[PDB]
Amino acid sequence: DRFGAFLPHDTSGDVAQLHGIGLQKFGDTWYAYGENKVNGNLFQGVCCYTTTDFIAWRSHGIVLDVQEDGSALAADRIGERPKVLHCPATGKYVMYIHAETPDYGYAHIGVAVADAPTGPFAFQTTITWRGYLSRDIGVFQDEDGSGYIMSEDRDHGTHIYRLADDYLTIVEDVACERATDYPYGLESPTIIKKDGLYYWFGSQLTSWDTNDNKYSTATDLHGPWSEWKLFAPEGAKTYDSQVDIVVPLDDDPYNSEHFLFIGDRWQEHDLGNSPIVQMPISIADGVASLTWSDTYEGTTHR
Length: 302
Known about the structure:
Elements: E1 4-6, E2 22-26, E3 29-35, E4 46-51, E5 58-64, E6 78-86, E7 93-100, E8 108-114, E9 122-127, E10 137-141, E11 147-153, E12 157-163, E13 170-177, E14 187-194, E15 197-203, E16 214-218, E17 229-230, H1 237-240, E18 242-248, E19 259-264, E20 276-280, E21 282-284, E22 287-289
Antiparallel strand pairs: 1-20, 2-3, 3-4, 4-5, 6-7, 7-8, 8-9, 10-11, 11-12, 12-13, 14-15, 15-16, 16-17, 18-19, 19-20, 21-22
PDB class: hydrolase
Keywords: galactanase, bifidobacterium, GH43, family 43, hydrolase
Assembly: monomeric
């Protein structure tokens, strides 16, 4: 395995744009969808990579292009935290993105659709629930085939939204949670399930600074959600990263004994070269725990 803090590269010799990624396993292969940030913070497309080992990353190029001027994904806009789900009812691959403007007032979800996980994805809609703000997003697909998008909403908390059966829009505000003793939900959400218990991870709102990220558990996605608790050591600032995704690695994604944590080390003035922190995360009996090891590469703080 490859664990620690590092700047990944693909098998073509380019920096792998594994920033704000979504990850999905289709067949025997992992698909990552990341923000292309080679030239800074504006939308430059969604990059796709595949792996079977989280060591070598094969590029599949830009799978959601920059769109034309006047659209919500034009070169002057912002598109972050892309996520993909495979829709059981339709067989399509649906991509979700935080569609944003430089003034940061837009706060929408963008929806694009493809016939294959490597695209090309065709940009369709921007949506909100009830007009509410949506910024950081994540996705979760349950054992019954239901799909969900998690969505940080600065005025209310972080939502779990249930998707329509065709995965193209939202039909239910399942939950909207603020962190314990906190006026907001946590951002950069990710959810996994193990032995009937859901684990929901997120980051505090501390701008560019890293913070001690936290998790909550529940036996129903509607809740009740437990107290939010740290999963890395206090003061470690999540090993100087911002949680992006946790994935189960075993054959049964809902009863796995091994999990992978990926967090972003955002570099404000060199975004395309932001490293990742890639580590095993221990998850059992309502407890999630992230621990550094001397053998890992890079440093616990950048």
